[PDB]
């Protein structure tokens, strides 16, 4: 229990390409997914996000 | 598959460790080795007395040999003496 | 008391007692472990005497005891009447299906060969009984999986967990 990790704030960017193009060139109609992480050290005390 | 004619082949027996006749169908006129691998799991050798003398290689490694490469005879002799005298003390004191 | 009524084909769990017996009684019995133990058990096994004894038991004895004795007599007579000896049950060599199987099944064969070669090396180098015994058990399991995977224990699984 000396350090902990946490997640928060899921978010989505704009899709990397439009539906028809994704259909054409085989690429999967998908968007990036972002999560804000947060690493805590209990011994000293810090939060890295 | 014509059978009336083809390149003939000779047959030569190769005795194994457990002495198995193995007549090897090699070309009717061709050089052959002294020993030929067989389904016996090892290689049998021609019955007639020839011997190219295979001159087997030394064993790759041994714990004693490998020990000699990091130690010397004197300290091993000293440890031998120590073990001996400890045992003798155990038996007769 | 274990000695005073001792006779072979007799299992002994808790090998501590076995090693005690061996060190104290190195002679007067030979105790084995594994397939080669069964090979030796079959070697010192005369079919005619056992078949006759079982036939006598069935002819004179009655009840549940007779029923088991009859069950065994089926197989025992099967080996007596035919010229096939029970050595065939224990295997010294495993045949290799020709290379058309081509690599689900082939992989099983590879496992067997790996474990056999490692066992050979282990006997050659000189290994503790524990390691070599475990390797022998592994070879047994590999041959098991090869002839019938999943019959005993969890089936050997391949890629995709199948």
């Amino acid at each position: 229990g000396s350090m902990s990790l946490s997640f928060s704030d899921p978010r989505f960017d704009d899709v990397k390409a439009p539906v028809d193009e994704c259909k054409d060139k085989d690429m999967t109609y998908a968007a990036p997914l972002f999560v804000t992480a947060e690493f805590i050290n209990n011994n000293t005390g810090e939060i890295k996000s | 598959d014509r059978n009336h004619d083809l390149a003939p082949r000779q047959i030569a027996r190769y005795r194994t460790d457990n002495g198995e006749e193995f007549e090897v169908p090699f070309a009717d006129d061709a050089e052959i080795p002294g020993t030929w691998l067989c389904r016996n799991g090892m290689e049998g050798t021609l019955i007639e007395g020839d011997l190219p003398e295979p001159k087997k290689v030394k064993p790759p490694r041994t714990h004693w040999d490998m020990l000699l490469e990091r130690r010397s005879i004197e300290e091993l002799e000293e440890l031998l003496k120590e073990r001996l005298e400890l045992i003798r003390s155990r038996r007769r004191g | 008391s274990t000695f005073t009524k001792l006779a072979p084909k007799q299992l002994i769990v808790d090998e501590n007692l076995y090693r005690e017996l061996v060190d104290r009684y190195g002679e007067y019995f030979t105790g084995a472990m594994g397939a080669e133990s069964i090979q030796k058990l079959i070697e010192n096994f005369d079919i005619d005497a056992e078949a006759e004894s079982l036939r006598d038991v069935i002819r004179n004895g009655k009840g549940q005891k007779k029923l088991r004795a009859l069950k065994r007599l089926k197989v025992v007579a099967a080996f007596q009447q035919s010229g096939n000896s029970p050595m065939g049950m224990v295997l010294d060599a495993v045949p290799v299906i020709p290379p058309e199987l081509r690599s689900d099944l082939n992989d099983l064969y590879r496992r067997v060969i790996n474990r056999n070669n490692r066992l050979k090396r282990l006997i050659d180098l000189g290994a503790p009984e524990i390691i070599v015994n475990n390797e022998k058990r592994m070879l047994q399991e590999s041959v098991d999986a090869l002839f019938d995977n999943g019959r005993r224990g969890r089936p050997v699984t391949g890629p995709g967990n199948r």
Binding site: - | - | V94, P95, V96, I97, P98, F147
Partner: protein, 60 residues
């Protein structure tokens, strides 16, 4: 109907040697040859043999 069955299961399906022979007979107009042994029976033989089951076909 026995001959047609044997024809079907041997030279229409499996027999690797008869098959080219029946094709040749049809092309050239000769009598259809005699069926051989289907190639699946031998793979069965090899597999049983591979299970340490000595399987032999005695002549008589």
């Amino acid at each position: 109907a026995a001959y047609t069955l044997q024809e079907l299961l041997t030279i229409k399906s499996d027999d690797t040697v008869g098959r080219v022979k029946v094709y040749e007979a049809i092309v050239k107009g000769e009598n259809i040859p005699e069926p051989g042994i289907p190639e699946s029976f031998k793979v069965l033989l090899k597999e049983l043999q591979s299970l340490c089951l000595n399987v032999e076909v005695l002549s008589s």
